[PDB]
Amino acid sequence: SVLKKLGWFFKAYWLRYTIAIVLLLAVNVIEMFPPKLLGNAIDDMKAGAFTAEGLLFYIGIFFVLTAAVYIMSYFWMHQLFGGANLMEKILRTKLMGHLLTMSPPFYEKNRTGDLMARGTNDLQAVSLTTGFGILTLVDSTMFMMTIFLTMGFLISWKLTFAAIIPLPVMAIAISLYGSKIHERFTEAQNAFGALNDRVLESVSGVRVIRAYVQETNDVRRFNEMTADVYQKNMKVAFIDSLFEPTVKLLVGASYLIGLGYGAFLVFRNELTLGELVSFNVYLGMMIWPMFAIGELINVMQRGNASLDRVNETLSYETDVTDPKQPADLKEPGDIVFSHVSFTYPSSTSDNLQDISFTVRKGQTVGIAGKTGSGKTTIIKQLLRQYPPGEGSITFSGVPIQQIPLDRLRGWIGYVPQDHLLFSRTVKENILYGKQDATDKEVQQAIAEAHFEKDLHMLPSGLETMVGEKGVALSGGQKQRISIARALMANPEILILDQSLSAVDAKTEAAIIKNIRENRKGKTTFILTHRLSAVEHADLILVMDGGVIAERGTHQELLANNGWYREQYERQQLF
């Protein structure tokens, strides 16, 4: 299976290992002559015919054979150990190529530590298997095959069908051991994924842990998990230590049968002491290296399980998010929702009911209602991060699909309600939006989200390193970097998702004033809970559960009695 799964790599490179199989045959035969040479030499010594020139011939043959095997197996080592590295690298590239270009509904079903390990640990295991396991398997198989052939013709077939009797038992034992070790190793790989997940969770949540004083209550859980992992490690140690004795037993049985029956053959005069020594050396080289057979199966089944994990993660069908047939219409200004009955993958109810939303040309639309009413669900309908069940964004006539995700994603502005950054300088993560921005538009977006003053606090303006996540930055600063970054693009469609909830009222005034200046005839989706930036719009939809309670602008809402009617006054009387 691991061979049938890794073959396509070899079918891609059958110029590098074809040269290496012939090379291994050569180095095995040349290194397999010395046994018979020694048998002949000792036979000559016993008869008293050992002559000086024979010693010179023997030592010369030994030296030349040693040099030949040295070099001509150095090439075989280099080739195969390089092939393993190449396999690992290409698999890693494929794995990250599949992780990308895949919508967010898979990250709820797939872990960040399971995937991180499924890259690093799984690929190092597959590399170790590709190199060392295949090396040993091919070498040992062909070596045993040829040793069984040479002792047959060149010594005898009775002495060699007789130490072969115990090898079928070896085969059945090797079958059972692998049959168990495969399951054990798939479990071990999943367990490493789980361990990485737990450590990642603990590391990410540290202030929440320290502020609550549960260091000890977490070292307890880690200790229990490590104890369970030890228990599993010993449920496999039991089997591995019950396997080795049968291996060594059978090796010793083959040795003893060969030795005794060869002595008996010598008694019948069908074989000589030189031939006895040769056969014993042949068996010693053939069957005694089997002590590493258990490690070979360990490597080969660990690799099989790791590669099965990689394969099952590497083909997931990437959800429903893909251009079917590019419609190739540059953005119509109309976004007309006809009937949208949507149901998240991890839900059993229609989270969104039929919503007849409609926004024409450039019109700020305000969507703000009870929490949990799914306004960011409607927004996610636009971005097509989730499969469409009944959604009909209907850009002009054409539905949401039939658009390039590159172009559709270029139309949208951004949807970061929770703040997100990357470990770099503030300049670089502002440049992170659009096509690397430009020379001075960075400063424009800086002193366009009322963020210029902040640079005084930062010791190195636009140059100080932004720490991992939000380290070295306050919450309002980080949101003000997000707005700047995503205003670098001057999007035709802008989506604000509670983008003003992490800064003061005074700076909120600057943003809305500067957003009013920036947004003139460009459609904007304002989602907020501060019911003041929603005052200006052609339409304001108040969201209640899966349905919009009321529709209108800032005026009729204060006329019709409803959610918006009571929410504005309370924020006004303050």
Binding site: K46, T120, D418
Partner: protein, 645 residues
């Protein structure tokens, strides 16, 4: 010193390793006694025909060997048997092997007849008895080292597993006793790698590398002892061999250390970078940075590939390829010494000894093939030990007093205090304020004046450089931060929900609140548990944060868990930002009123939620401006309040 710590962890388990080595010593002793049976079967039951003969009867005359079945005391002929080619000859009465013409020039000549085949077979019937005896002897001897090998393997497996468990536990405890700064300035994947992807390197250093090393070192010692038993001159070269392996371990180290450490560092970078990409995959799939992140990754991947190829040559002139050069040099010596002994026909003594040594060479190299296969892992795990050990041996750590203290009055106080991250950014300057049981709220519009800096200074996440913080006159530098952090609770500005049910998230895996803490959820959560199909205890939110839940709902759960714990001081950080919906934000301040039971620090950028506070601060630019209440509004807070309405 890496090796000393490895030895100490090993010595934590002495019984296990000593018993295993003793059992394996027994097994190897049995196996090494093994080949003497081959030696003494050759020299006796095959070469007894070649020694003098004074029962074996062919033709009805010839007598029997001196030591053989049916031994009366009788010697009349002193006959002998000699080997010529594939034929044997029988001389009746009292060298060279030239063919009824047998000559021993050393001269006298005698007559002998060919022993045919059936008559030759007739000779070794007693030899058949001896062969079956010895064969059965060794066959029985095998099953004793059969149950010794099993025992020693199953014992080393426990020794390795226990060692790795202990090391992992120690590392985890140490990382939890590290300062927050350490985590602040290091990627999560980088630290995570040093715990999970780095200790696996040290596990293999124990499970297979060192276990195989001791087994091979136990097999080699026995083999050299047996070689000394047989010969004392060829055993001296055998002893010389080991310094070769020492020089094979020194060279593979002076040539693998740098590249192995580079590979490990690149692997840490690759774990960190992959974590970062997974976390922020929405900015990759919404701002079309996919190709640039792929390019960065591929840069790291090709660097790792290059260093691995910077090691692809050292491992190629090593291992079995090079283990076969010692094997053939052993064969050459076994030929040369025996030849220099047999030039004058003095080589017939070591015909079973020759076979024993020939078998011994086959013995010795397989342990060596085991040893060489781990030097790649040995020098790789030396790096991993250093990275983990440096973490385990760290002097900037903070001793933690685990015990939590009792309830304390809600008395917070701040003297002239001057905090600065990285010694240059003076966040706070001369901050001084007090509270007894009322709501003291810190407000600033500057957005970078250090509100959260004050909050995390109170928790001693970072140590202040000036002044002192005293709760009930208790300097926070009394350490035991578990008592300092148990008196008080925080709702983080950016909440982080853990995995498992929302009830588990509120409970936080503590055995203090029973299932009937729904009141905390029902305190401020309206119909959300009714919205979601099952109650708190049966719905598991998506692992890590509740991406299946909204930001406001996550913040609701975080605030509930802050209230689920009952702190003497309730600290909040923009606790009502993403749940600002006033229908529920008013239930958190109307039905969940702070009341006098708590001393609460309400932080927020909206004046509505702090209108009833009895102490308001400005702390602009790290310096305070106003100390009055809501109605004490003249100039600065007036501006902020006016725009809100």
């Amino acid at each position: 010193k890496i090796g000393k710590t490895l030895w100490r962890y090993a010595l934590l388990y002495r019984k296990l390793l000593i018993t295993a080595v003793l059992l394996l010593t027994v097994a190897v002793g049995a196996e090494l006694t093994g080949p003497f049976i081959g030696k003494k079967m050759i020299d006796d039951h095959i070469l007894g025909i070649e020694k003098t003969w004074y029962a074996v009867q062919f033709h009805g005359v010839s007598y029997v060997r001196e030591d053989r079945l049916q031994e009366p005391v009788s010697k009349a002929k002193e006959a002998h048997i000699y080997q010529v080619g594939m034929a044997f000859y029988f001389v009746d009465q009292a060298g060279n092997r030239t063919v009824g013409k047998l000559t021993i020039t050393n001269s006298r000549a005698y007559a002998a007849e060919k022993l045919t085949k059936q008559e030759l077979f007739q000779f070794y019937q007693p030899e058949i008895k001896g062969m079956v005896l010895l064969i059965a002897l060794y066959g029985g001897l095998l099953v004793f080292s059969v149950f010794f090998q099993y025992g020693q393997h199953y014992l080393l497996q426990m020794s390795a597993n226990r060692i790795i468990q202990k090391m992992r536990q120690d590392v985890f405890s140490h990382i939890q006793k590290m300062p927050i700064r350490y985590f602040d300035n290091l990627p999560a994947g980088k630290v995570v790698a040093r715990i999970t992807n780095d200790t696996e390197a040290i596990r293999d250093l124990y499970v297979t590398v060192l276990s195989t090393f001791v087994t091979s070192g136990i097999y080699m010692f026995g083999i050299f002892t047996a070689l000394f038993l047989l010969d004392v001159k060829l055993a001296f070269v055998a002893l010389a061999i080991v310094p070769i392996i020492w020089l094979w371990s020194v060279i593979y180290r002076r040539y693998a250390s740098y590249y192995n450490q580079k590979i490990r560092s690149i692997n840490s970078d690759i774990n960190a970078k992959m974590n970062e990409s997974i976390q922020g995959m929405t900015i990759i799939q919404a701002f079309r940075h996919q190709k640039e992140t792929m390019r960065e990754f591929e840069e790291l991947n090709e660097s790792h590939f290059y260093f691995q190829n910077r090691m692809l040559n050292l491992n190629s002139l090593m291992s079995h390829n090079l283990v076969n050069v010692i094997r053939n040099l052993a064969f050459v010596a076994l030929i040369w010494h025996f030849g220099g002994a047999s030039l004058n026909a003095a080589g017939i003594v070591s015909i079973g000894v020759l076979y024993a040594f020939v078998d011994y060479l086959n013995r010795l190299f397989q342990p060596i093939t085991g040893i060489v296969n781990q030097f790649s892992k040995l020098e790789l795990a030396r790096v991993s030990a250093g990275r983990v050990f440096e973490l385990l041996e760290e002097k900037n750590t903070e001793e933690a007093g685990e015990p939590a203290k009792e309830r304390a009055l809600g008395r917070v106080e701040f003297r002239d205090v001057s905090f600065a991250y990285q010694e240059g950014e003076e966040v706070l300057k001369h901050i001084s304020f007090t509270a007894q049981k009322g709501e003291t709220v810190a407000l600033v519009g500057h957005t970078g004046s250090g509100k959260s800096s004050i909050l995390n200074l109170l928790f001693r996440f970072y140590d202040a450089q000036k002044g002192d913080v005293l709760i009930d006159g208790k300097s926070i530098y009394n350490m035991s931060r578990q008592e300092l952090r148990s008196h008080m609770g925080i709702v983080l500005q950016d909440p982080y929900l853990f995995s498992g049910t929302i009830g588990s998230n509120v409970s936080l895996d503590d055995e203090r609140m029973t299932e009937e803490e729904i009141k905390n959820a029902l305190r401020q959560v309206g119909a959300e548990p009714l919205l979601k199909k099952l109650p708190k205890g049966i719905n598991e939110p998506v692992i890590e944060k509740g991406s299946t839940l909204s930001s406001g709902e996550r913040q609701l759960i975080s605030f509930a868990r802050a209230l689920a714990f009952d702190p003497a001081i309730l600290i909040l950080d923009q606790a009502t930002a993403h749940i600002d919906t006033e229908t529920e934000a008013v239930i958190q301040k109307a039905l969940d009123v702070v009341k006098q039971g708590r001393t609460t620090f309400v932080i927020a950028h909206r004046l509505s939620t702090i209108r009833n506070a009895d102490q308001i601060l400005v702390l602009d630019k790290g310096e305070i401006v106003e100390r009055g209440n809501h109605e004490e509004l003249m100039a600065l807070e007036g501006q902020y309040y006016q725009m809100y309405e």
